[PDB]
Amino acid sequence: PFEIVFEGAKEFAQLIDTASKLIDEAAFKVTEDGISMRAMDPSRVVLIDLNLPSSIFSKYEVVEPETIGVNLDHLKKILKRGKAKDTLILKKGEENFLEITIQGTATRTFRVPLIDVEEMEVDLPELPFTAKVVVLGEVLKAAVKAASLVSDSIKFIARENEFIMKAEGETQEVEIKLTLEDEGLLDIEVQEETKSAYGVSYLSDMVKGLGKADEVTIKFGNEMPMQMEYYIRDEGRLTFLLAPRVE
Amino acid sequence: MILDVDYITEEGKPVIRLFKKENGKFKIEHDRTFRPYIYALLRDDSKIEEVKKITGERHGKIVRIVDVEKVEKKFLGKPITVWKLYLEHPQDVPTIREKVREHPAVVDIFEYDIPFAKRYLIDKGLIPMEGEEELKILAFDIETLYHEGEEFGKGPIIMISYADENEAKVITWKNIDLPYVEVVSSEREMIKRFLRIIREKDPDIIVTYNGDSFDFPYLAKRAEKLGIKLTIGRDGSEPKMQRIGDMTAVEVKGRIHFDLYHVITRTINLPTYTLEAVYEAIFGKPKEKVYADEIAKAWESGENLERVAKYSMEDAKATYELGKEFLPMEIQLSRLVGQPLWDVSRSSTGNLVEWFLLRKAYERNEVAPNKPSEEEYQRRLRESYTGGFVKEPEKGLWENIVYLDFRALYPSIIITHNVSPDTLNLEGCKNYDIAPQVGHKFCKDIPGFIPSLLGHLLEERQKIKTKMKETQDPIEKILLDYRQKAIKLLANSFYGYYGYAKARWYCKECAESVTAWGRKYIELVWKELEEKFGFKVLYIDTDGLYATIPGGESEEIKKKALEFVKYINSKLPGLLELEYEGFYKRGFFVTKKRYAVIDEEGKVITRGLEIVRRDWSEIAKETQARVLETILKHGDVEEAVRIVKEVIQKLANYEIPPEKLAIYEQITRPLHEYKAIGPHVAVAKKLAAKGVKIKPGMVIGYIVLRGDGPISNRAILAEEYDPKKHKYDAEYYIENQVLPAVLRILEGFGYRKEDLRYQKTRQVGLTSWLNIK
């Protein structure tokens, strides 16, 4: 059983919403160190990893370690009610259910049932990426939607001080070159020319719930998977590992 | 030499005329002595007294049985005593027929629906085209402005071309400077000159290609509108309409109007039967086509009329060449059965056989059965009928294939097993042959009527083939190659006659029996071919079998295949015989009736695979051929697939020329009548607004484009298409053009569309970049 408290129920809501467009169920590993959730999309193309150290919660009491499988859509409904300055309380006891309290002006407590979820043990890979980029949710959300109107795959290209994103349609196309001076690109670090393609449809769910000011770190390599990291409260981290589309 | 036969009436008496060409001179013989007659089977050959008194009326007077005579013919082989009831005129027969078969005195009547002129040739023992008289051939064609949704005969006849043994001219009423064009004053004058040419050429045979429904009729309309007599007949008479079969033909009293359409169309299969296509598929030589749009423009704005004139002289030269080509055979055929060329050239093989039996029935003293009654004919059309034996083919690609076939299979069976109506299930025969599955019995004691005649026809044929490879008169060695081919055609027609609904000597049992026996010998050959010589039968169809010794050497196969033949022919009964027909380096059989093979000369033979109809662009046609030759000539489906993929890709990366994408089609009628609006039909009315020709007779080339709505609304004229301005629908050309053409061939090897489609990138799973997975 545990008692976890997060300040700012909206930001937390959005987090779960994001890392949920590809999955229906998840098991959350609650330990003394923090909360972690790891799962793969039904197609086994995207790996979703969520790590939330105790450090980011205002209150962190974990008596006995636990893993609670919950239906993400159900959970999303509840958290959708949280406001920016609402405090989020997560209480687990002996019973087989999770207590959630959105505390504030309209404080209310919801009861969420715990289901069993096939917990596929898989670790997070340390891939030898050759290119790292830090972008703004805006530009990235734009290019991904833009590309979805012409092709089913978008291509990533990165060379020193330069990052491109293009796609070829049946009639018209899309392309976007960013350099350190587009501020849509906040940082870039490559080691060698790096090209790779990915599925617009997977990137869609991955960037759907990204604010415009949100910042994301993307790491990839030629004909290799792409990694996207979103930091929450600085230490908390949401990671997506996306299988490439090889030519 | 007798050209044709008819009869006019004088004083109410028939006057049979014979149109002859004896020694370059056209002569007309009259014969006022032949007499119409029917046959009556009287149960009591004494009641003939009150029976020969019946009478009827058709146009006033009362038709009287001007005579009777007890004759002793025989029926289906058995003896019979009937009475020959003479009449004064042919017309009187339908009258008294209705009666005579009423009076209980008769059991039934016979030989009563046979045309007077035809009855004459038969009885008189006269056979047409007999002899070696030089016949004058003249071909002619007409070009008009007529289209489709317009009045037939309204549009003028633009030109009239004709050609013969040595000359090919065009008559028109607008100036064209060409040594072969005869300019004339008016349409009327054109018609006059034409009438004059036949007067001066005086042909025995006038050749046309579909002149029965187009040329002559159209000519008649115009002559009339312009008030001219069409004095084409050697007796100054006009071409006349004459019902034959279920159509309306045209005759010229003193000459033989030979219309190629009927002959060609029924002795060669083709997607369509345009003069161009036919000339091409008979001589290989191509023939350019000029269309409505062109012709109308050239005639209107008198510019370019030279090529529209060449097309015309081309049409005639073609019709003439084809005529000389098909005339020899049809003539020998007319000689074979005993009827006039005009009639034979327009008859079916079944009616061709019937005519033959009728005179062979009279030569022997055999009375002829009657046609089935309207109800008999109807429940006969309703009765199922047998067809050619076909073995589901063995799949895969095979090498060193031999094709063995039976020589004159059905005729041979009919002969050696005495299959005929008059020998079917007789009783008390010293010997019978029994049909394999249907168990029908056939007396072997006395040769059946039909088997007797068929036996003689085949003996007579070998005679030909013998006296043929012998003599050294190439012209003769040609004429008799024709006489032997006519016999071949005629004999191969007996099988189907047995089941011909309107046949007198119809016999469903004979039909089934011939088929069952066919099956028996096919299966026997198949059985011993695999069980004794170690062959593997790949495909059988009606007469032939394809086989091979899996893995065996090419010469071993050819050697053993031939060994097997001589071996099996020793065991096969009567005239049944198999022959080593051909050899193929490699081949494959997709489904019944669909296969492909290739001889050692590299010549490919295919059925039910190759895409023909213009409905296919050259990219589809071309690729399918790349595929077919790679598999047949080199044996690898693998390089075939490689090809298809590369092409599919080029289509996708817009690397294929617009021409190999253009699909052509002609407008069948006004663009306001079209229900189903295809691409061209839409590129039609699309340009119609832009105000243009759009005359039901022109072809509209199109190219589908990367639009959003259906194909139709997105096709651009095969010219209003320009790159860097147009993006063709590669998906269309891939999914509805190249894939279908190629899958008829690759599907069988296990291939599928998924395997041939293209895509630059493919989604892969993440799992291999994971470790604990």
Curated annotation (Swiss-Prot), chain A:
Q: Does the keyword Thylakoid apply?
A: no
What GO terms are given for molecular function?
Answer: DNA binding; DNA polymerase processivity factor activity
Output the NCBIfam families linked to this UniProt entry: pcna (TIGR00590), PRK01115.1-2 (NF002219), PRK01115.1-4 (NF002221)
Q: GO biological process annotations for this chain's record? A: leading strand elongation; regulation of DNA replication
Record's function text: Sliding clamp subunit that acts as a moving platform for DNA processing. Responsible for tethering the catalytic subunit of DNA polymerase to DNA during high-speed replication. Unlike its eukaryotic paralog, loads on circular DNA without the replication factor C (RFC) clamp loader, although RFC greatly increases loading efficiency. Stimulates the ATPase activity of replication factor C (RFC) in the presence of ssDNA. Stimulates the helicase activity of Hel308 and may alter its substrate specificity.
The name under which this protein is listed is: DNA polymerase sliding clamp
Say which domain of life the source belongs to: Archaea
Under the heading PROSITE patterns, the entry gives: PCNA_1 (PS01251)
Keywords tagged on the record: DNA replication, DNA-binding
Indicate the family of this protein: Belongs to the PCNA family.
In its UniProt entry, the species of origin is given as: Pyrococcus furiosus (strain ATCC 43587 / DSM 3638 / JCM 8422 / Vc1)
Instruction: State the InterPro entries in the record.
Output: DNA_clamp_sf, Pr_cel_nuc_antig, Pr_cel_nuc_antig_C, Pr_cel_nuc_antig_CS, Pr_cel_nuc_antig_N
Q: Which HAMAP family match?
A: DNApol_clamp_arch (MF_00317)
Curated annotation (Swiss-Prot), chain B:
User: Which family does the record claim for this protein?
Assistant: Belongs to the DNA polymerase type-B family.
Enzyme class per UniProt: transferase
Q: How does it assemble?
A: Monomer.
Q: What is the lineage of its organism?
A: Archaea, Methanobacteriati, Methanobacteriota, Thermococci, Thermococcales
PROSITE patterns the record matches: DNA_POLYMERASE_B
Technological use? Because Pfu DNA polymerase exhibits the lowest error rate of any thermostable DNA polymerase studied, it is routinely used for PCR. It is sold by a number of companies including Promega, Stratagene and ThermoScientific. Various mutations to improve its abilities have been incorporated.
Q: What is this protein called?
A: DNA polymerase
Q: Which SUPFAM superfamilies match?
A: DNA/RNA polymerases, Ribonuclease H-like
